[PDB]
Ligand binder design. Sequence first.
Ligand SMILES: Nc1ncnc2c1ncn2[C@@H]1O[C@H](COP(=O)(O)OP(=O)(O)O)[C@@H](O)[C@H]1O
Ligand SMILES: Nc1ncnc2c1ncn2[C@@H]1O[C@H](COP(=O)(O)OP(=O)(O)O)[C@@H](O)[C@H]1O
Ligand SMILES: Nc1ncnc2c1ncn2[C@@H]1O[C@H](COP(=O)(O)OP(=O)(O)O)[C@@H](O)[C@H]1O
Ligand SMILES: [Mg+2]
Ligand SMILES: [Mg+2]
Ligand SMILES: [Mg+2]
Lengths: 371, 371, 371
Amino acid sequence: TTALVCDNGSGLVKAGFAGDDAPRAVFPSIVGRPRHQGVMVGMGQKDSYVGDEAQSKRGILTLKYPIEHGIITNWDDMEKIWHHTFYNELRVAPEEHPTLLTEAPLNPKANREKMTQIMFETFNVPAMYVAIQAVLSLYASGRTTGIVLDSGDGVTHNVPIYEGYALPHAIMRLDLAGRDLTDYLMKILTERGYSFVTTAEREIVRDIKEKLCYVALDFENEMATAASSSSLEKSYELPDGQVITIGNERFRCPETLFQPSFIGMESAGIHETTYNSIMKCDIDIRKDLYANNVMSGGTTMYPGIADRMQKEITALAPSTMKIKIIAPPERKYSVWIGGSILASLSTFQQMWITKQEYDEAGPSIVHRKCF
Amino acid sequence: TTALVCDNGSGLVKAGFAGDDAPRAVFPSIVGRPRHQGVMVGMGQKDSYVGDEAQSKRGILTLKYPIEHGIITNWDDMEKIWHHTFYNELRVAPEEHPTLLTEAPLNPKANREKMTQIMFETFNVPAMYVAIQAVLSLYASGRTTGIVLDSGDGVTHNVPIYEGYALPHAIMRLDLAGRDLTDYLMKILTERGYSFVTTAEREIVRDIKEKLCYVALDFENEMATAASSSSLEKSYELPDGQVITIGNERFRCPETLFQPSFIGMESAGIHETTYNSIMKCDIDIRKDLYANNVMSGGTTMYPGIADRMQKEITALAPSTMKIKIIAPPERKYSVWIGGSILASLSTFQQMWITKQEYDEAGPSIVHRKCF
Amino acid sequence: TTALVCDNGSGLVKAGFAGDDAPRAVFPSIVGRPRHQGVMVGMGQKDSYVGDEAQSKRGILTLKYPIEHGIITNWDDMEKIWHHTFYNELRVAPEEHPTLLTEAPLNPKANREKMTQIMFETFNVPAMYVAIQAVLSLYASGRTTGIVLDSGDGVTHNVPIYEGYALPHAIMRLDLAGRDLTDYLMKILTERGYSFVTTAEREIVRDIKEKLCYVALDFENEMATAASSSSLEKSYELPDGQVITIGNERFRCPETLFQPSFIGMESAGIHETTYNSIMKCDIDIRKDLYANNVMSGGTTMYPGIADRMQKEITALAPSTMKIKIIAPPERKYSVWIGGSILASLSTFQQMWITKQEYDEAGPSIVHRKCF
Ligand SMILES: Nc1ncnc2c1ncn2[C@@H]1O[C@H](COP(=O)(O)OP(=O)(O)O)[C@@H](O)[C@H]1O
Ligand SMILES: Nc1ncnc2c1ncn2[C@@H]1O[C@H](COP(=O)(O)OP(=O)(O)O)[C@@H](O)[C@H]1O
Ligand SMILES: Nc1ncnc2c1ncn2[C@@H]1O[C@H](COP(=O)(O)OP(=O)(O)O)[C@@H](O)[C@H]1O
Ligand SMILES: [Mg+2]
Ligand SMILES: [Mg+2]
Ligand SMILES: [Mg+2]
């Protein structure tokens, strides 16, 4: 039988079969419940929608995300989402397929206890595994060395690897990702009057960000240019025809990644975090880590991120080092692709947590056979 | 047992069984009593005449409408009208048929509380249920969603719906309707010397309104044409052979709907009262409401109201929208058609307020089950 | 030279000299224009009215507010109001008096830009300044650490301040204030048959809300008691001598502040707003914020509001964190008293935007020299 691969992204769930080059079913990780008094019988049924059928009817819905900063926060909702991904998107029976979930580094352990318990007692998958997304991303690049800078909707994290041996002490994590950038955009937009207040309008500001934002190579130069000319402004059309116009908001939002003092945080930017992660690693290996700066996750899709990161890290690291930021075109799906590759491997068969293992050991077993 | 459907409009009573596509009994809502002395015996009796009879003797009667601005004020007269409807018109005892009574939004709760009291304690129906009119209007059109404009004899209200879910905070009620247009037409005919005063002559200026009134496309240019030549004049034959002629009084009267400042009121004309109702909805669904604008009720029957409405809204809403005024050909009875459809459903049986529930709950029960 | 402190409210304008502990002039911020036709010669002149002379005549006027949600919607009218305050009320030649004005947080930049432009060019004041309203609201209390809850007629907004250092990420601004409660009260009044629809009647409903509305502590049980008997009902004599009797509408109105769903808004109540604001401030200062909540603005003068908000915040914070709400009885004018104090301080004399500085810098200086 062929195992599945279900990447529980913070924002979007990725799913697909083991061996597929690309995921087969992608849909935002939302649960919607209406917030108005229904009037028509035979109509407005299905108290709760999931994924696509909650986006396409969000006008009257309260969209709750069940995954917050990479940590599942509302279990009965994630159960519905898994049930959907299994029985409606892929159209598969879970009991007859192994599966490969994922997790971010340094998440509370009870999180993965509960993931495993749901998978084994509710859906009765024969065997399942829980990887760490950065390792999978480094698989996907077809590589053996690097410092995966992964960042998606919830979290931004680094994971240095050298010739197959992880360096757990050098891992750095940071809760500043796509959702926080969106929430800061909602706020900088009110300088022009555009008030977005509802959970549904978060999904409009998200796409405004996705389509219009970019990261300036140099922030102060871009601020000056925007202030002294209109060459940057770009106009966007709401769902209801209103045409909004944004200028320096196109780069003031992505720039949050590098100066988290914009959104009130104290910690340092992603470039400084990566440098401080490399400098935790033994002297003999930093030379290769500087030369394999892999990237992953959606939030690294902004134009100008790769060049900005290369410039900044070159500013940090010594003059003699050969920095290289690697940005695969499919980096949004790198984690899932690597997961498929790992699941298809010939030597991975023994590594599963068999149903018998859970029977004889409980959910705590998942800490001995996982990274 | 078959279920009855009644629609106690402010202008006419529409009543008849479910499953039919047209009301069985249609007649005006007036009870007339003599204002003169009856000298002859046997003939000249029955101090109260109702419905069509009252009109046929409107010479020697004072005609009272028990309903004014959708509110039932004279309860004795209204009970008379219902007694006529049940026994003389439909010929079927109310003691053995569930009933559905239409009603208007933002009405005093005492209104429907007393409707329930009267139906259960005076006529002893097995079960009754009260429904809004815009909801049923939408039912008739076979739609899932759309902004309904309903404008009968007394009350004009908008109820934007979405996928079977309404928006109570987006309702508007504008108590300016056919009766007020009749009064203003009566007031502006005197510019020619046709002094209509009596109520019986209100029943005739209303006939003039129903026959000749039409809504122009541009008021200023129509006035220009009217001043230019006699092309717009048309004549009408009173009951005693006199022939009248009216020019710009034909469209100056429906103009009220678009400029209630004509009759002193301040609230904005139906174009603005519909635009402002859409512009209070979730920003997501406005594009949907624009393209599914429904109409209903008699007052929307003026030749050309749909085009003026479309013009005004398209001049208000963003240029990218694709407006559509859904005007059913039978829109006069649309409320009752929708009521028949709703009463005929198999899964609507969960909504009837049974005699048992009223007896052990009191009239206040009607609010727990009625929108 | 004496300075002027002009707190432009959305419903009232509190303006006067700095140093006093009360404004020298208060008048509603409405510009009325006659709407009927004048017939008597020697009358009908002065075809645009302002303030209280636009109350006592409101019978024959359409009342329009310049500010809708702390935003200056109209400028041709706000110029009239400012001219009125400077010349007719205070009788002061503005060309020789520094003026200090106010604004809310997250308020569009063009708003204060154009305020500066008008004051420096239309009136030609030697110097001026604009201050957020939570800063002044906290000055008036004499503290230096606390999270203000300003609740005006148009806007409700918190500001966490610690030792004089604001927390710009934790400023929660909610556009739901006294005016929206006025409109909700008008909407629910009809349930009893009372129908107020026009601008003038909106003032009557404002006074009804002021006099009779109050906040309950347990809304569900308050409704239970109100339904049980008429113990809570009180009467009000409209200006023509009519008498209305409002019952549960007394506290169903200001309950909206703690359940913004009633009017369709999604955000959580103001207690939840304040608590969510607090839990985003670094952990060590939450203790000092939980004990220094300062109320302000007119809409906070509901009876029982302080008890309700204290109870509800206790329901959200942990058990051992002291929770207090400081509510000065004079709080309606807290913003203006803070403005007076700030203008009086000896060290503030350098913080003005001088006419010279504007002349050589342009409006953008407003965002530079002012917070
Ligand atoms: N082309 C893009 N440009 C900028 N941001 C993007 C782009 N595509 C996705 N994002 C952002 O990245 C996040 C989704 O990336 P993804 O890696 O799928 O997150 P997750 O793995 O948590 O589901 C979203 O917050 C989205 O706003
Ligand atoms: N063909 C028509 N043209 C213009 N006005 C009409 C026409 N028919 C009815 N009306 C007006 O609409 C009112 C009756 O229509 P209706 O929709 O049935 O109101 P209701 O249902 O409350 O009784 C009358 O007052 C009349 O003035
Ligand atoms: N006792 C009261 N109860 C409730 N609301 C009140 C009371 N007094 C005044 N208000 C409301 O406060 C508002 C005006 O007060 P104010 O603080 O000055 O608002 P603004 O900042 O715009 O000037 C009005 O909307 C009024 O309805
Ligand atoms: Mg990911
Ligand atoms: Mg009608
Ligand atoms: Mg204020």
